[PDB]
Design an enzyme around this catalytic site. Structure first.
Site, PDB file in Angstrom:
ATOM      1  N   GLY A 134       2.982   2.394  -2.363  1.00 21.32           N
ATOM      2  CA  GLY A 134       2.996   3.028  -3.665  1.00 21.32           C
ATOM      3  C   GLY A 134       4.221   2.767  -4.507  1.00 21.32           C
TER       4      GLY A 134
ATOM      5  N   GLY B  70       0.812  -1.227   0.000  1.00 18.71           N
ATOM      6  CA  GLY B  70       0.000   0.000   0.000  1.00 18.71           C
ATOM      7  C   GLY B  70       0.838   1.266   0.000  1.00 18.71           C
TER       8      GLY B  70
ATOM      9  N   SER C 194       4.450   0.030  -6.835  1.00 19.92           N
ATOM     10  CA  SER C 194       3.949  -0.289  -8.165  1.00 19.92           C
ATOM     11  C   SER C 194       3.108   0.847  -8.734  1.00 19.92           C
ATOM     12  CB  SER C 194       3.153  -1.595  -8.136  1.00 19.92           C
ATOM     13  OG  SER C 194       2.219  -1.606  -7.076  1.00 19.92           O
TER      14      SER C 194
ATOM     15  N   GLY D 133       5.385  -6.121  -0.435  1.00 19.58           N
ATOM     16  CA  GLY D 133       5.472  -5.633   0.958  1.00 19.58           C
ATOM     17  C   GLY D 133       5.497  -6.715   2.020  1.00 19.58           C
TER      18      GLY D 133
ATOM     19  N   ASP E  92      10.558  -4.031  -9.204  1.00 21.19           N
ATOM     20  CA  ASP E  92       9.392  -3.775  -8.368  1.00 21.19           C
ATOM     21  C   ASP E  92       9.282  -4.904  -7.353  1.00 21.19           C
ATOM     22  OD1 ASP E  92       6.339  -2.225  -8.677  1.00 21.19           O
ATOM     23  OD2 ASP E  92       6.495  -4.081  -7.527  1.00 21.19           O
TER      24      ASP E  92
END
Ligand code: TA1
Ligand code: GTP
Ligand code: GDP
Ligand code: ADP
Ligand code: MG
Ligand code: MG
Lengths: 440, 429, 361
Positions: free
Chosen positions: C100, C98, C102, C254, C251
């Site tokens: 940010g 969450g 990607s 988490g 990329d």
């Protein structure tokens, strides 16, 4: 009919429970077969008290104890031993997949398959209660069950019941001795999770009890039977006022009050002075002026932390036997006039007292002697911080190279949780430092 | 309950397996025909750790053999304890690997690993729970090394969450059990460091010295070496098959001995070893065991622990005993020889205890140790590897059977990186 | 073993999420200029952190609003320039589910990240040098890690209930580690690169979680091999000199606290697999930071496949950028602190990037 519920988690819990229910059974006369020849002999009675025991129309008194675990090597000794015809067959053994001495397995992966059954059993033992008083966990830091399952269980029981005592016993890890090289992780984590949900946590340490059994009873080769019998006598002394007649009776809600000043500083230490064999049972008078002065000796505690490295903060002394309340007051007074026992400037009293008339029992072929009067003191003092710091230092030596973290991660634990537990436990050390600075 | 699935890849694995069965049966009371003949009850309670029930209170073992050559299977069948196995678990072939890993991992093993995995599936899915496998193989060959490593790879691809413990034999420094050892050993280490949870290292020279020095045997057959090896394989599972005061399954040892994953190579040991005459002069107490277990002679790893530092040590005792003695003895051992341990593991000892001792010893034990002294064993292999690879001494037999030259450099680099991982902590920081 | 270099680090705060607004979350992050500051909600202690670059996306109205067209021209443009100068380049992300990460690299169809802008600046800068003296060639690859297993993203799976081809890694003696069976496809025009990236984004594994409805539960890597053939002074045929470069855009995923972002089954397994990969990279950064202090330290890359296929990017020969995406939430405060801690531990890495050319003459 006011009831307390015992829960035992792990090998140490089950062993302490066996030693505790042996003592209860030899006290009331209630036998391994659940039958009591005391109500059907003289013509009436209430000897098997319904606070820790139950009753069935056939005279069978099933106890109130789950005996939880996740490895069948332990409960099957009960199920195929002497005390098999006593407990309820719902002992809640899993039979599968021991925790392997990590906190993440016994909190996330294998624990969640088993906790709902234990909660259902607790609910079934608590729906026939016309108002209980509290719980009593017997867990052991230095494991997966005692560290994780107790956390999950005290976390769920702080949601359903809420306004009920959730006391606990805990094998505090010895500083030098230890039978595990992954115990500090679990210890700090459980002290992060079993803090905002529990009320009091009475600590013990196998090293100190080894030392006292060596020094007083003269045993050079002790095994855990003799250790668990001392802890059984302690848990009997702290659970007698409900179970026997006395004069100055203590209830379970009175430990949260006179002993837990701040809601996080609730880590006291037990002590049981008259530990003397049959040989030394003579040559000693065994009055209160000797007992209560022995219970405060550094070489007779149950934790390996010197009380002289900190100020006492609260103490609850609970007696048994032929105690006339003038020796108790005189003992407290002459203990107050000593310069070593140092109290803080916001608790001058610090000397809760509790008396009871029933003396302690004795197990045949045992180790202790028949003494007409016994004492059990529970002290909240500021020395424990040092011990905690030791574990904290271990946590900082092993976590700084990410040792053993894959194992905890593999069972879903999120390293940020470890850092959070560390920072939470450091503030408690800072609180123990705050509660020594005398008032301005 | 917990259930181990044994595998025997090669001649050494088969012999150790036979001796281990001939050890566990006399421990549980099973006879060669499969019937129970015992005196106590605690044997049949946890019998499913290794055995299964057939029809009439008969107990068959959960062993799954594999061998490219046919001789060892017939030797194990015609032996004393041969009528108890499951004959459909014999999965052999012909035309052995020929001391070539290439002929036991790509060409011949590719035809029979499917059958062996079928038997593994059939025996595992029968189990309620599963705690891991237990293989026995010997580096220095093509059947053991190749087939066992391929099987470990395919199992850890199928059943990953369990333990593929294996009691591997390593090659001796001075004498050469086989000419082209370093190729196969380095490749097996490449295929084991990344596909295991625990592993044990056994060496023949250490066992010869143990047989000649303590046991006072001047002509030790292979059976004695094996009888000195099944001991610890029992001691590991003694806390599953039997009860005790402080239990320790394989997973507990794995969590407490492998701080970083790759460093799972250990040194085993037995405690009470003595000659048939010098047994009436020795005291069968705990500290004699504890000083017979930490000595650099009993360790089968052929690597003196004094040349390094014990990262971890584990001790599984078996007998009626006092835990104060065990704990205080381990504490004073740590305090005395502090330089041979680490400082960032504060307590570097795991204890574990059973209550049902062995058939004739009132007090037995078992020792495991992860130390930095085992880097020498791989340094030696890599030196031989460089000496024999710098001009391709025996390499053309490995290429022809489907391999390339890059896998060799990969295995060399991995083995050297592991040696460096141990040497990072060999030096006091 | 040529020229020295240092790791570039950049931080990026995201605005509030819906789950944070519903929970009435406060702003525990502030900028005193180029710095970063965090105040615990209870007001017991402060922390401050300094970086080479900082960004801000809390609201569109503040000064110094670093947007998608700004983080490129601040961070990624040096990477393309040093690629044209010959060097290798990596840019890899870090953060929490969450945060940010990607959104800064890939982007949206109307808010492109670095990937749909990097390979466009590439072609806007190659058209100015399309003369006959320097001839270019670009190959692409786009691969994925899922449950500690490698997978290819740009491949049309056969019609079957399960078709995701597992692949393997391999160590080259000179260059370094790499992947087998890699579809090192060719690219000539943006119309093909965008299509390949579309197919990749479709093939990358996605699912719904509490902290992200479109969470990516795999580690993605986007590789571009660029080669320019050049003419120099020679005694015979011209066009003999060759300069090579690798551009990796990575990329990551988490930590995914499995309690709050509640989930069970395959999601828990890949989250813990993702957790193990994230757990080794922090160890690797802590081990590489202690190289410059002067201590002997081991650098474990083989405990996880991501670090195993990115040895050249952390150390090795590659100028590397680390984009740390964080959150302003008061609930997501410890994880943000951990991200910033690993960032400031990653600044201290020193690598050796060398111009890589093979004359072949
Ligand atoms: C009174 C007494 O002490 O008899 C001992 C004995 O004298 C000695 C020689 C036994 C003997 O051990 C050996 O002879 C031996 C020979 C070569 C290599 C290794 C051992 C014994 O055979 C070993 C045997 O012990 C066992 O049977 C254990 O259960 C052992 N059993 C077997 O391995 C076994 C193998 C095949 C058939 C039957 C048993 C064992 C150990 C660990 C786990 C399971 C089983 C016993 C009582 C003895 C003899 C018989 C002399 C010792 O056994 C062990 C494993 O330590 C060797 O030291 C101990 C104790 C003695 O020194
Ligand atoms: N007082 C006391 N402590 C014990 C006893 N048995 C084990 N312990 C303690 O337990 C710790 C490790 O065992 P536990 O924490 O109980 O492990 P567990 O609760 O059984 O959970 P498992 O990991 O599944 O074994 C050690 O540090 C011991 O000190 C006992 O009989 N009496
Ligand atoms: N330690 C030990 N080694 C053995 C035993 N039996 C055989 N060996 C050795 O194991 C080595 C490898 O043989 P192996 O790989 O099985 O031959 P293969 O059948 O061609 O694969 C030989 O060189 C033997 O010396 C034993 O019982 N114990
Ligand atoms: N700078 C930003 N401005 C507005 N929204 C953002 C910004 N950064 C991220 N988001 C929102 O956060 C989400 C992206 O988080 P994401 O990186 O996808 O999670 P993860 O990386 O864990 O899969 C998107 O839904 C996007 O709308
Ligand atoms: Mg257990
Ligand atoms: Mg993402």
């Amino acid at each position: 009919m006011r009831e307390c519920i015992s829960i035992h988690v792990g090998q140490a819990g089950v062993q302490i429970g066996n030693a505790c229910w042996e003592l209860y059974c030899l006290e009331h006369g209630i036998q391994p077969d659940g039958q009591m020849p005391s109500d059907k002999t003289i013509g009436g009675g209430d000897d098997s008290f319904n606070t820790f025991f139950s009753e069935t129309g056939a005279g069978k008194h099933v106890p109130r104890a789950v005996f939880v675990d996740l490895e069948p090597t332990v409960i099957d000794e009960v199920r195929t031993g002497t005390y098999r015809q006593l407990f309820h067959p719902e002992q809640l053994i899993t039979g599968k997949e021991d925790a392997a001495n990590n906190y993440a397995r016994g909190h996330y992966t294998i624990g969640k398959e088993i906790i709902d059954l234990v909660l259902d059993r607790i609910r079934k033992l608590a729906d026939q209660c016309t108002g209980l008083q509290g719980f009593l966990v017997f867990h052991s830091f230095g494991g997966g069950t005692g560290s994780g399952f107790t956390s999950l269980l005290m976390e769920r029981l702080s949601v359903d019941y809420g306004k009920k005592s959730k006391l606990e016993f805990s094998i505090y890890p010895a500083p030098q001795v230890s039978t595990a090289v992954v115990e500090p992780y679990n210890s700090i984590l459980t002290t992060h999770t079993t803090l905002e949900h529990s009320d009091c946590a009475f600590m013990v340490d196998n090293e100190a009890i080894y030392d006292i059994c060596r020094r007083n009873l003269d045993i050079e080769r002790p095994t855990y039977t003799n250790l668990n019998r001392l802890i059984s006598q302690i848990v009997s002394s702290i659970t007698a006022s409900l179970r026997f007649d006395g004069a100055l009776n203590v209830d379970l809600t009175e430990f949260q009050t006179n002993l837990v000043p701040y809601p996080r500083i609730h880590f006291p230490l037990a002590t049981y002075a008259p530990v003397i064999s049959a040989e030394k049972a003579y040559h000693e008078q065994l009055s209160v002026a000797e007992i209560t002065n022995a219970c405060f000796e550094p070489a007779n505690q149950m934790v390996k932390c010197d009380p002289r490295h900190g100020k006492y903060m609260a103490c609850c002394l609970l007696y048994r036997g032929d105690v006339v309340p003038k020796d108790v007051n005189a003992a407290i007074a002459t203990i107050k006039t000593k310069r070593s026992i140092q109290f803080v400037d916001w608790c001058p009293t610090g000397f809760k007292v509790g008396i009871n008339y029933q003396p302690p029992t004795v197990v045949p072929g045992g180790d202790l002697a028949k003494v007409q009067r016994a004492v059990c003191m529970l002290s909240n003092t500021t020395a424990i911080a040092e011990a905690w710091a030791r574990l904290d230092h271990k946590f900082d030596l092993m976590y700084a190279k990410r040792a053993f973290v894959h194992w905890y991660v593999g069972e879903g634990m999120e390293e940020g949780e470890f850092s959070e537990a560390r920072e939470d436990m450091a503030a408690l050390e800072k609180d123990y430092e705050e509660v020594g600075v005398d008032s301005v | 309950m917990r259930e181990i699935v044994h595998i025997q890849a090669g001649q050494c694995g088969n012999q150790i397996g036979a001796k281990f069965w001939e050890v566990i049966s006399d421990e549980h009371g099973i006879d060669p025909t499969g019937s129970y003949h015992g005196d106590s009850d605690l044997q049949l309670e946890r019998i499913n750790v290794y055995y299964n029930e057939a029809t009439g209170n008969k107990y068959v073992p959960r062993a799954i053999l594999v061998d490219l050559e046919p001789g060892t299977m017939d030797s194990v069948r015609s032996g004393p304890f041969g009528q108890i196995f499951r004959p459909d678990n014999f999965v052999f072939g012909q035309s052995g690997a020929g001391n070539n890993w290439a002929k036991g991992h790509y060409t011949e093993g590719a035809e029979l690993v499917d059958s062996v995995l079928d038997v593994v599936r059939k025996e595992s899915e029968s189990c309620d729970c599963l705690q891991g496998f237990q293989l026995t193989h010997s580096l220095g060959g093509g059947t053991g090394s190749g087939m066992g490593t391929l099987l470990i790879s395919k199992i850890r691809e199928e059943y990953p969450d369990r333990i593929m413990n294996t009691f591997s034999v390593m090659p001796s420094p001075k004498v050469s059990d086989t000419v082209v050892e370093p190729y196969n050993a380095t490749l097996s280490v490449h295929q084991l460091v990344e596909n295991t949870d625990e592993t044990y290292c056994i060496d023949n020279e250490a066992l010869y010295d143990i047989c000649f020095r303590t046991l006072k045997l001047t002509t030790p057959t292979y059976g004695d070496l094996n009888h000195l090896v099944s001991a610890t394989m029992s001691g590991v599972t003694t806390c599953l098959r039997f009860p005790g005061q402080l239990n320790a399954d394989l997973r507990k040892l794995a969590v407490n001995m492998v701080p970083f994953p790759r460093l799972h190579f250990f040194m085993p040991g037995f405690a009470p070893l003595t000659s048939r005459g010098s047994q009436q002069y020795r005291a069968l107490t705990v500290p004699e065991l504890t000083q017979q277990m930490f000595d650099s002679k009993n360790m089968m790893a052929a690597c003196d622990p004094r040349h390094g530092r014990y990262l971890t040590v584990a001790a599984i005792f078996r007998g009626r005993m006092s835990m104060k003695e065990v704990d205080e003895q381990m504490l004073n051992v740590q305090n005395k020889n502090s330089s041979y341990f680490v400082e960032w593991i504060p307590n570097n000892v795991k204890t574990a205890v059973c209550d049902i001792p062995p058939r004739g010893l009132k007090m037995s034990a078992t020792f495991i140790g992860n130390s930095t002294a085992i880097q020498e064993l791989f340094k030696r292999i890599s030196e031989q590897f460089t000496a024999m690879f710098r001009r391709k001494a025996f390499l053309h037999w490995y290429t022809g059977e489907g391999m390339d030259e890059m896998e060799f450099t990969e295995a060399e680099s991995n083995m050297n990186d592991l040696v460096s991982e141990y040497q990072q902590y060999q030096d006091a920081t | 073993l040529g020229s020295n270099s240092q790791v570039t680090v950049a931080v990026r705060v995201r605005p509030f999420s819906k789950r944070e607004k519903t929970e009435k979350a406060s702003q525990v992050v502030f900028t005193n200029g180029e710095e970063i500051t965090v105040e615990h909600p209870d007001m017991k202690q402060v922390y401050s952190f300094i970086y080479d670059v900082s960004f801000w996306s809390f609201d569109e109205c503040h000064p110094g609003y670093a947007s998608q067209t700004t983080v490129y021209e601040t961070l990624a443009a040096p990477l393309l320039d040093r690629a044209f100068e010959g060097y290798n380049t990596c840019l890899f992300a870090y953060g929490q589910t969450g945060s940010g990460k990607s959104y800064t690299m890939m982007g949206l169809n109307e808010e492109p990240g670095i990937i749909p802008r990097f390979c466009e600046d590439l072609f806007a800068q190659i058209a100015k040098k399309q003369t006959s003296e320097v001839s270019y060639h670009l190959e692409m690859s786009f691969f994925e890690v899922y449950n500690e297993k490698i997978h290819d993203l740009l491949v049309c799976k056969g019609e079957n209930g399960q078709r995701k081809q597992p692949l393997r890694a391999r160590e080259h003696p000179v260059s370094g580690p790499y992947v087998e069976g890699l579809s090192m496809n060719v690219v000539s025009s943006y119309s093909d690169i965008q299509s390949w990236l579309e197919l990749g984004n479709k093939q990358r594994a996605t699912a719904a979680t509490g902290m992200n409805d479109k969470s990516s539960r795999s580690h993605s890597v986007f590789t571009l091999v660029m080669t320019q053939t050049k003419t120099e002074v020679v005694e015979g045929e011209e066009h003999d000199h060759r300069i090579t470069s690798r551009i990796n855009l990575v990329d990551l995923a988490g930590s995914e606290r499995c309690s709050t972002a509640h989930s069970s089954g395959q999601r828990l397994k890949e989250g813990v697999s993702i957790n193990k990969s994230l757990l080794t990279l922090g160890k690797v950064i802590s081990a590489l930071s202690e190289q410059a202090n002067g201590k002997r330290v081991f650098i474990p890359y083989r405990e996880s496949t991501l670090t195993w296929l990115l040895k050249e990017s952390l150390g090795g020969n590659s100028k590397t950028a680390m984009i740390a995406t964080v959150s302003p939430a008061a609930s997501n405060i410890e994880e943000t602190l951990s991200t910033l801690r690993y960032a400031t531990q990653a600044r201290l890495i020193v690598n050796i990037a060398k111009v890589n050319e093979d004359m072949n003459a």
